[PDB]
Amino acid sequence: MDINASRALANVYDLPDDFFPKIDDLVRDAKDALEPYWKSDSIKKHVLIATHFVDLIEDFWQTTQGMHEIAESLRAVGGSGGAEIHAHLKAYAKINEESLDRARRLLWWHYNCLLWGEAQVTNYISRLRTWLSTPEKYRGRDAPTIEA
Amino acid sequence: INASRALANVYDLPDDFFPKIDDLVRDAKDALEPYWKSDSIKKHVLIATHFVDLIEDFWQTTQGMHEIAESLRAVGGSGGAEIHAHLKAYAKINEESLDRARRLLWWHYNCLLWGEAQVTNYISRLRTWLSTPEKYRGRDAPTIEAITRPI
Amino acid sequence: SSSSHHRSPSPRK
Amino acid sequence: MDINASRALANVYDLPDDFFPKIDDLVRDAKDALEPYWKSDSIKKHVLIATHFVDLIEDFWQTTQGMHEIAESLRAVGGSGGAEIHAHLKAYAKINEESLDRARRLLWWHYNCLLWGEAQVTNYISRLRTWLSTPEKYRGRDAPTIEAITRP
Amino acid sequence: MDINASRALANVYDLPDDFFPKIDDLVRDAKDALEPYWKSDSIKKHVLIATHFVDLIEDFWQTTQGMHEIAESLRAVGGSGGAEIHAHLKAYAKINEESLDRARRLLWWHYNCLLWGEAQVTNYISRLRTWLSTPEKYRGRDAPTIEAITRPIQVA
Amino acid sequence: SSSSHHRSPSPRK
């Protein structure tokens, strides 16, 4: 495969939003794989970045989910609250969940690059892009995976 | 060792030592943009950039949560104290997270500009000066102009 | 650097 | 200064009971500075002594405070216990408080000597005694310190 | 230190409590054997630890004992203001007793290691634990000892 | 030319 075309086809924001493991499993794997580098106090790029995003998720994910739940409960219980309140709440939750989707994607990217290598990860992304462009019939019955 | 030490020192500060968030983010972006154009992977670059993004993403949402919670509680007739309590808890969590982000951003920005040593020494001196009981102190805090002068 | 890799992690497109 | 006069003016128990940080802060800083040596299972003087005194405080401080609380509560109640009971309890709490004050002072001493050096702390205490015997207006605006430094 | 010495000390922590000399005698002997190292201002592990533990005892032993005494006194006289009084007092005294028992045992270990040697003492304790855990009929009628004490001082 | 420092720590005066 052409390195150039691969790198051009590889981007973490192109993915379907269902390719990404649940946030709990992702955070757990990230922490369990980072513990050595933490204890060693390592200054590697992906270590630093994945640490930042682990912290970001742990901080704001449950708060955003609680905000969405609160907005729904407030619009359900009745109009006693208001429309501006629910609109502002939904907008804040929307912005936060966009930021959290970005954090999730980049945490995945950074963790997988730490494990395997960003070269392997971009190759995998390109090959998965192809697998997804192809129709179900003339492609593998199960998707690829890194060194798999 | 000394890294976590100076970090704990940074956390051991009064919250009135840290500039306003607008000034801080402005200065950080101004100092970092060249490094972005240069595609630099420096540690302080990595961390300050990511904290700037964090702040610009969540600060306004958190302040709005605070204000709307207080307003609807003053109203009193919207849902119940459950909503206000849930909102206060979330806002507290996000506030402490953003405070940590603000502090680490200050630390890394200043380390990048001037020097990690010049910032660590000043922070140690200031933390010591603040610890003491005001009778063995000096009567004049250490001022930030010490970072700017080399040694 | 052939890759964008700006502001540290991969930049959007 | 004259090194002899410095070492002679340097004694931890000369300080007026308020130069010393609070007990929680002191134990916390001591543990934070010790845990490396604890893990490395070190033998050195200051580590050993600071550890012993941390343990002593952890063990007896809260008990002594509770003893004082008990003495005051029984004093308020009046009929409970009695007079000589209150007297003996207060005397015991007082002896324990003397021991714990000595422990706090020695803990400060050894923690700081471990961080910087007992010579540095000696000079610090000496210069502080001098700077503190002088009146306020001829002191200046720069008290004495140790001022750790870092090199890139 | 050696895992042998660690085993010996962990065993000291769990001995029958009748193996240990009276605290008065222990403190006395510790002071008398340490004052030379005090004058010489030595910084040896056992010296430091024994000194600190004997000071600890000197300070808090009689205090804890009087605490017990007065707790029993208030329980006997009655008229307590709530039972929490005696509860908290005896809990404090119990924590003090645990701390002081550990102190006595480490003082014993360190003073005896100073006298004889860490090796001699850990061997002694290994033998004594093997002897105590074992039941009679396979044991020996007389316990083991540090043979350097009860061996004759021969002089021509 | 050494301080008291007896028993390992510093004594009173």
Residue numbers in the entry:
A (entry chain A): 1 to 81, 122 to 188
B (entry chain B): 3 to 81, 122 to 193
C (entry chain E), F (entry chain H): 250 to 262
D (entry chain D): 1 to 81, 122 to 192
E (entry chain C): 1 to 81, 122 to 196
Can I see the authors' text?
Particularly striking is the much larger size (~260 amino acids) of their single capsid or core proteins (CPs) which in mammalian HBVs comprise only ~180 aa. DHBV CP (DHBc) expressed in E. coli self-assembles into CLPs which package bacterial RNA. In line with earlier data the major type of DHBc CLP conformed to the clustered-dimer T = 4 architecture known from HBc. Confirming selective aspects of evolutionary conservation between avi- and orthohepadnaviruses, the new data also reveal unique structural modules, including a direct contribution of the very C-terminal residues to the capsid shell and a centrally inserted extension of ~45 aa that behaves like an independent folding entity.
The low folding propensity of the extension domain questioned a direct role in capsid assembly. We therefore replaced residues 78–122 by a short G2SG2 linker and evaluated the consequences on assembly and particle morphology. Sedimentation, NAGE and negative staining EM data all indicated the formation of orderly CLPs, prompting a closer look by cryo-EM image reconstruction. The resulting density maps at 3 Å resolution revealed the same architecture as in the wt DHBc particles, except that all spikes remained narrow as also confirmed by the asymmetric analysis. Also, the fold of the subunits in the asymmetric unit was nearly superimposable on that of the full length protein subunits with an RMSD of 0.6 Å, except for the missing sideward pointing density. This missing density was accounted for by the 45 amino acids of the deleted extension domain whereas the flexible G2SG2 linker was not resolved. Difference mapping confirmed that all density differences between full length and internal deletion variant localized to the extension domain which therefore behaves much like an independent internal appendix.
